[PDB]
Symmetry: D4
Subunit: 50 residues, 8 copies
């Protein structure tokens, strides 16, 4: 699964009709799942605001 950063492009697809946007994704490299105790409350509290 992944989360989108921003949009950096716009084009027309192969069908010649549909509009496609170029989506920048957060790298899932340099990303791990860790138990709630290993993380600092701060970063979590910032995630909750998002």
């Amino acid at each position: 699964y992944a989360v989108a950063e921003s949009v950096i492009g716009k084009r027309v697809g192969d069908d010649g009709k549909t509009i496609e946007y170029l989506v920048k994704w957060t790298d899932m490299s340099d990303a791990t799942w860790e138990p709630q105790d290993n993380v600092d409350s701060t970063l979590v509290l910032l995630y909750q605001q998002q």
Copy 2:
């Protein structure tokens, strides 16, 4: 195709005359084209302002 982030360098080329700048590019890794429905209006509306 690619989009430029910023300039982080300045030098003289091999001809000994022309000025070259060092351009940082957005990685086209972690980037996909997706149909207009898969994207959130927000990120698009931010792209339109750019």
Copy 3:
């Protein structure tokens, strides 16, 4: 060793109980240890505030 950037996810672990957060890490690629003289005072003074 590594340093955490932010939290970009939340899930339940394999035990079906514990809460896990998805932690983005700074890449340790593009990172070297250098003696105190090679670094500019500025970047250090910014690190001290962190």
Copy 4:
């Protein structure tokens, strides 16, 4: 050649005396040298302020 982003660490070296800082570097991947005409004046004018 390379340019430093920030400092994200501090340690003591192998000699047991000297202080070392952990320097994050801009990736020189996703970076090319391009002639002054290919670049937008804007990004250059931002580089000049740096």
Copy 5:
């Protein structure tokens, strides 16, 4: 979802009992899903052998 390349490490976990291996993963950056027609039969036939 992800696919494992190889094992490059071995350690003992935080419980002090369980054995953990360090798994190298294929980057899911530089990876896209594409319809069967866009791909060459060859690469597919190589995948089928895997």
Copy 6:
């Protein structure tokens, strides 16, 4: 533009019919276009065989 390395996955698309393969791409980071003189004949001769 890009060049395919291998196939590392297989799935069914959103339409519920079409077969999609997961294509690993060569990173276009760490890649530059250079004049024929800057390159060694060898690497070129290897490209010609491909």
Copy 7:
């Protein structure tokens, strides 16, 4: 901690005496520690030969 792939360079250090080699490291991005059950015996058996 890290593991070395190969050597791709050779130079003289800042002291003007010592010989330094340029070491390519496996990225610790795209690498996680996982319990012995999550890994396939094969990859482990290949690690043991190393």
Copy 8:
């Protein structure tokens, strides 16, 4: 400074005459200079053959 892996492309430059090849470079990320003692003789002996 950098070292070339292979050639993965061929095109005509902007002048409309010169032939350009697309060169894949080893990432200088995940690469450090280390004293001759920190490296294993093996990897060095493999570098000498190159």
